[PDB]
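Sample intake sheet
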Amino acid sequence: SPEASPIRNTHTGQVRGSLVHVKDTKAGVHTFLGIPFAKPPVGPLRFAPPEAPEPWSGVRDGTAHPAMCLQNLGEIKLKLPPVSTSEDCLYLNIYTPAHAHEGSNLPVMVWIHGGGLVAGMASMYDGSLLAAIEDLVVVTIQYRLGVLGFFSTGDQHARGNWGFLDQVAALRWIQQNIAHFGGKPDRVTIFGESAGGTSVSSHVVSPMSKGLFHGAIMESGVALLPYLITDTSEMVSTTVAKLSGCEAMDSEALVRCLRGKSEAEILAINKLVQMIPAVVDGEFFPRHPKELLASEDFHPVPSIIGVNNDEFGWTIPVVMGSAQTIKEITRENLQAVLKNTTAQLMLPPECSDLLMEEYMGDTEDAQTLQIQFTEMMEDFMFVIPALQVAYFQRSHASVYFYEFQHQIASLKDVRPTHVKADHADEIPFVFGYFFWDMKLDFTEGEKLLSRRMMKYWANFARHGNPNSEGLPYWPVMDHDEQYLQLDTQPAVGRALKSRRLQFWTKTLSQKIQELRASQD
């Protein structure tokens, strides 16, 4: 008989949660929602580091989801929870086994959501099933997004990376508080998908995050994900200044002015400057992640890193609106399309012909050209970044690498048949339910796949190693370059995308380097 309405202690006071139950297990789950880990980043706290949360008297209600951080709300439809959007959004949610109490010393898994550092929320991710089935504490965190998350002057007035500093604050909170919920602060694994994977990968290299986590899982996203992290964002800073009317070239003034804008004014600005990058701010990143990764003094935690076999298959080109443009590619327009794409990817114009020879060769068939084009995009955004980060980590600590390959059965009549494992298609297997706003069921094979992935992730949360008796062997990535192919029947592979990896890290980067050296 577990308690309904459990009460737990935090440093700031008591919180009351709920008892829930899930399929496939006797075990109950306690949930504690909307726990503040920082003060509301409002007024003078906008574009400033997070500060400690305020204490409260009596028992805080932990039965409602928090507001999502400010984001432009707005095909492919998701089951969004009924929450408001607000600047006041520095909250986290906790899922524990019902039997967990002070001192239970369960592993802790901390989910960092994706959404391009401009969108997303913790409340879409229900950790109950993962918590109950694999006997661990699951925390989902929020962090500032868009202008509020990443605005930078390149100087002391707004260094940048507010959203990453929020993630640090949430991890500090977990160290201080998770024992009260039955977690072991010395067994924290961070995990996340897409920009959440970029976030995890960013913590792995950041000196500010050392000691806050002991293992990392990066799903379809790492710190090299093109243009989420840059040196400086002077162009974007200038754009925000113009779009706001502040329009000073004094940093202090710009920040003063932006702090005056209402939530509505911020949303309006945010909409017109869709993507604001993380910068080398000096604190969270002393150097660009690329330099941190290549360092001899780099000491990563053990990691799982992986990608899906079709990252640019469907969801991403549909959401970016480039699906239509891609269907218009033919041999006649290929050169022009590649020239246009090279520019948009911020690569030297000379790269277009190398990309063409590598990805398309002498292909004439229009549909084949389009698939080759999609391959080039997958490799640039996800696969090559992941393989590079894996290469830099694996000489210092265990890396377990995966390619997820499973084509979801219930989607076969929902989307093009050539699409395999799309971006985000592994999330249902990790969490144990589907995120789309439509009635979809797991096949028997898919239930087994989900149970396997939950166990791999939890084994890794327990021991820094995903393997256990009963599960297919997942070898560590070493000089043999082995990885696990995740599907209904898992299998080991080796040297994922070997040819493409050589192309990007020799031929293409040679031309990038050469045309950068021609600065003078």
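Comment: The chain has one domain: 7-323+373-511. The radius of gyration is 23 Å.
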